[PDB]
Amino acid sequence: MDVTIERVNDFDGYNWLPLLAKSSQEGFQLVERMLRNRREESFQEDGEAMFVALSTTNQVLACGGYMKQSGQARTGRIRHVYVLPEARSHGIGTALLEKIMSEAFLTYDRLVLYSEQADPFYQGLGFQLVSGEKITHTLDKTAFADS
Numbered sequence: 001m002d003v004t005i006e007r008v009n010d011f012d013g014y015n016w017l018p019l020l021a022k023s024s025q026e027g028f029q030l031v032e033r034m035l036r037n038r039r040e041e042s043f044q045e046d047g048e049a050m051f052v053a054l055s056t057t058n059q060v061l062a063c064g065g066y067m068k069q070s071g072q073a074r075t076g077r078i079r080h081v082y083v084l085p086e087a088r089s090h091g092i093g094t095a096l097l098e099k100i101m102s103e104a105f106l107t108y109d110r111l112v113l114y115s116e117q118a119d120p121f122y123q124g125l126g127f128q129l130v131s132g133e134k135i136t137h138t139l140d141k142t143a144f145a146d147s
């Protein structure tokens with residue numbers, strides 16, 4: 001499934017309702033939280049970015065990004081990763097994550113994330129599963145580089 005991955009510079013330039021609706025149906029708040037909190041966590045500052053995957057017809061099929069992990073130094077947190085159900089299993093999440101990781105490791109020496117649902121996906125990308133309160137997966141830059 002052909003997509004383009006694009007940096008979000010203007011949240012108001014996309015129709016987010018499909019992503020909001022499907023994610024909410026599934027019990028996920030992550031798209032809602034992202035869009036509601038977008039004035040404070042804009043993903044526009046240095047060390048942060050939000051991406052969308054656009055279909056060949058300009059429709060949003062996924063989102064995901066990164067920003068600074070609070071309290072840690074040199075650690076970034078991967079945030080708000082979600083692919084529309086009908087768009088899953090076509091390589092979109094992998095393309096999105098590869099872009100995020102390659103860019104985020106320019107700023108951070110470690111990337112972390114919290115995912116209860118997608119361990120196989122994240123392990124396939126090289127993340128290590130960890131038992132923390134705030135994080136489920138971690139990846140050091142040196143491990144990323146060595147791959």
Ligand SMILES: CC(C)(COP(=O)(O)OP(=O)(O)OC[C@H]1O[C@@H](n2cnc3c(N)ncnc32)[C@H](O)[C@@H]1OP(=O)(O)O)[C@@H](O)C(=O)NCCC(=O)NCCS
Pocket residue numbers: 081082083084087088089090091092093094095117118120121124
């Ligand atoms: C996890 C997620 C981001 C992966 O993105 P994706 O575009 O579907 O994944 P890709 O097609 O790039 O596949 C990469 C890996 O992701 C995983 N994956 C594939 N389809 C998936 C799906 N429908 N749901 C969860 N994970 C999936 C597989 O481990 C896959 O490895 P493989 O290609 O070697 O078999 C995406 O499916 C998603 O947002 N799922 C949300 C719902 C969820 O968490 N699923 C749990 C069960 S309800």
